[PDB]
Amino acid sequence: EGWFMPFDNWLYQLQNADPVEISSSGFEIAVIDYSKDGSESGEYSPEEIKIMVDAGVVPVAYVNIGQAEDYRFYWKESWYTNTPEWLGEEDPAWPGNYFVKYWYNEWKEIVFSYLDRVIDQGFKGIYLDRIDSFEYWAQEGVISRRSAARKMINFVLEIAEYVRERKPDMLIIPQNGENILDFDDGQLASTVSGWAVENLFYLKTIPLEENETKSRLEYLIRLNRKGKFILSVDYVDDGSDSFENISRILDYYEKAKRNGCIPYAARSDLELDEMNVIEGIQPPE
């Protein structure tokens, strides 16, 4: 099983997201960027977000709280020549993203300023990326793993408190870093609305080992019990109509659903740059 699954589907699209297309899609919850192009000038208007809300879609805003993104409104050119102590190295897997010491006041305040705009736009939730920065800094030896974990839990709670002062029913959904719950006293578990995970059954088109998947599910199943919904995205769609591709999608859908996760099969290029519609599958019939 009696899984908590309050949405029949979900969409994840961080580029080229079109409110009008989203609103008539049958997707029930949509995680998008707060801007048409990532930049301040591309910020979606209250009106554009209302198009989705009026159609019954819950829009949710992506916010990277674990890294600075150099195309965002907050990025200062003086950071090159006068680098803040909290501004760390560029992510080799994501050019333009930089790991941040997210526990420093300046970064938290950048992020609240980001949340300020997201609320005014009319977003009904926030989707919090790079939780797993707690692991980056621990793996670099910069602070202890428990310190890094506690600081991130606390940051997420201060975020919750910020947004729900203004919008009491705001959805709060972390992405990945679910093993941070080893360091929680209960308050993070109870404060989130749900949790999202990338790469749960497949890493792109390659299946994960059962033991690796099982360890992640232990965290997520316990959250589901508490009435927290689980969003899953695996990047399993290679874009073809091959048997191998379509059966992998169905297998991923199957595995997600029997474990209380609401699946979305994304394109294997990780670009999240269209609304990935798969006939007879996504969204369901």
Q: Where are the domains of the chain?
A: 1-285
Residues 216, 200: contact at Cβ < 8 Å?
Answer: yes
Exposure pattern of 250-285 as b/e (b: 16+ CB <10 Å)? eebbebbeebbbbbbbbbbeeebeebbebeeebbee
Residue with tokens 């705009």: 117
Residues 148, 135: contact at Cβ < 8 Å?
Answer: yes
Query: What architecture is domain 1-285?
Result: Alpha-Beta Barrel (3.20)
Q: In whole angstroms, what is the distance from residue 191 CA to residue 172 CA?
A: 8
Residues 230, 200: contact at Cβ < 8 Å?
Answer: no
User: How was this model experimentally determined?
Assistant: X-ray
Residue with tokens 């009696």: 2
Q: Which resolution in angstroms does this entry have?
A: 2.2
Q: In whole angstroms, what is the distance from residue 248 CA to residue 153 CA?
A: 35
